[PDB]
């Protein structure tokens, strides 16, 4: 019933949200980009190792 309860609830949740939205938006972004980059790295380096691809190229081309 007191405005003190409302002030505290809006304060604590105000901090929780203000950090959560950017931190979590950029988290799902960096997870998309971590998995995306590592997909293009891990499968390509495996292809170059399995077929021994570097054999047909000069040192640091």
- Annotated domain spans of the chain: 1-61
- CA dist., res. 25 & res. 45, Å (int): 30
What is the gyration radius of the CA atoms in the chain, in angstroms? 25
| Token code pair at residue 57 | 């190229």
Q: What are phi and psi of 37, to 5 degrees?
A: -60, -50
In this structure, the dihedral spanned by the alpha carbons of residues 37, 39, 41 and 47, taken in order and rounded to 10 degrees, is -160
């Amino acid at each position: 019933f007191t405005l003190i309860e409302l002030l505290i609830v809006v304060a604590i949740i105000g901090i929780l949200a203000a950090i959560a939205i950017p931190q979590f938006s950029a988290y799902r972004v960096k997870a998309y980009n971590s998995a995306a980059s590592s997909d293009l790295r891990n499968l390509k380096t495996a292809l170059e190792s399995a077929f021994a691809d570097d054999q047909t190229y000069p040192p640091e081309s």
